[PDB]
Amino acid sequence: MGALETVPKDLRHLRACLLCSLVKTIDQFEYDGCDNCDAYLQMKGNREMVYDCTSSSFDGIIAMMSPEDSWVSKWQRVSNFKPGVYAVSVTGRLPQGIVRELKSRGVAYKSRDTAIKT
Amino acid sequence: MDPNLWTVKCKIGEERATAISLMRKFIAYQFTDTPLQIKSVVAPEHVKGYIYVEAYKQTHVKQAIEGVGNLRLGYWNQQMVPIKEMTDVLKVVKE
Ligand SMILES: [Zn+2]
Numbered sequence: 001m002g003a004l005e006t007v008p009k010d011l012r013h014l015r016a017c018l019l020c021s022l023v024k025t026i027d028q029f030e031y032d033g034c035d036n037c038d039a040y041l042q043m044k045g046n047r048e049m050v051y052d053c054t055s056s057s058f059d060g061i062i063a064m065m066s067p068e069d070s071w072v073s074k075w076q077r078v079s080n081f082k083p084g085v086y087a088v089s090v091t092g093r094l095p096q097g098i099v100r101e102l103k104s105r106g107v108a109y110k111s112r113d114t115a116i117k118t
Numbered sequence: 119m120d121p122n123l124w125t126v127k128c129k130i131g132e133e134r135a136t137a138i139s140l141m142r143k144f145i146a147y148q149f150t151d152t153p154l155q156i157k158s159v160v161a162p163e164h165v166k167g168y169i170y171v172e173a174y175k176q177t178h179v180k181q182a183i184e185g186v187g188n189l190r191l192g193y194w195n196q197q198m199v200p201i202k203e204m205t206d207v208l209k210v211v212k213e
Contacts, residue, residue, distance in 0.1 A: 002145040008138055059210045061134055063141035063159040070157040071120040072172050075208055085141055088162060089210040115210040 002065065002083030006035045015054035016087035017041075018094045019102075021078060021112045023061055023085045029054055036081045040107055041098070052095055059115065060088030077110070089114040121157050121174045123199035123207060126183055127192035130167045136188040137161040137169055143182070154182045160207055168192065170199065170207055 006024070008014055013026045020036040026047075033044030034053070043049040063085050064073055073079040078086050090112040094102075099109045128136050137159040144154040155178040160170040169189075171179045179196050183189040199207060 002141075002148060004142065004145050007141050007145065011134060011138075059163040060208075061137055061161050063137045063144070063161075065141065065144045065154065065159075066157040069121070070172055071204070072123075072158045072160060072208070075205065083141075083145070085138060088160070088208055114208075115212040117212050 003035070005032060006082060006084040008085055013056070014058075015050070015056050016058040016090040016112070017054050018090060018092055018112060019053065019109065020081055021058075021076070021086045021090055022081070023058065023087050026050060026054075035084060040102060040105070052098070055090050055092035057091035058087035058089065059091075062086045062088060076114075087112070091115070119174075121172050122201070123160070123170045123172055123204055124176060124179045124196040125168045125192075125199060126171055126179065126189050126196050128167060128169045129188040129191075132188045133161040133165060133167075133169050136186065139186065139188070140171075140182065143186070154178075156182045162207060163210065171196070 008024050014023055015026050016023045017034045029050045030047050038044055041053045043053050065083055067073040067079045102109050140159050147153050156171050156173045158172040173179050176196055
């Protein structure tokens with residue numbers, strides 16, 4: 001089920017997708033887009049879109065191998081996504097324009113910020 | 119049914135790298151007769167000196183981490199995370 005291309009290639013300039021929480025390097029989002037969301041986010045080939053759709057501020061990682069048979073994937077709401085590395089919590093928000101466009105297409109946006117705040 | 123979480127001693131400061139290495143290992147073996155049977159690995163932001171491995175059986179963890187240098191001091195024993203504490207593994211607090 002899993003693809004090696006999805007896995008972060010190194011630990012520098014890691015970012016997490018604000019829509020699905022997938023973690024890859026910035027160059028990998030540029031090169032391949034988001035493995036889960038790119039039909040909707042279309043960041044492949046566009047660094048500016050990568051900066052808008054992903055965040056360098058995230059907490060923890062999860063190497064998700066069998067999302068279909070994991071308790072962790074259920075808690076993290078990633079059970080329908082591809083095997084890959086995911087952030088435990090992501091700081092940030094998709095731009096309003098992208099959220100509105102997602103909504104018009106039948107995609108809801110629920111924040112990947114899971115942090116307990118204060 | 120749902121699997122358990124197990125702690126595995128890990129070379130300090132190498133937790134993130136090791137989780138990513140196990141992701142690659144899982145993918146590497148997925149079309150072989152010796153696949154990894156673990157379900158996930160968690161490296162929480164501020165944890166030092168171990169990682170968490172999700173599996174139905176402890177033996178699956180041992181089998182997955184065999185040969186992984188950073189986990190060599192965690193090879194003989196893994197401790198189960200008490201079920202009541204499983205969401206604390208994934209807790210993030212921001213002041
Ligand atoms: Zn995504």
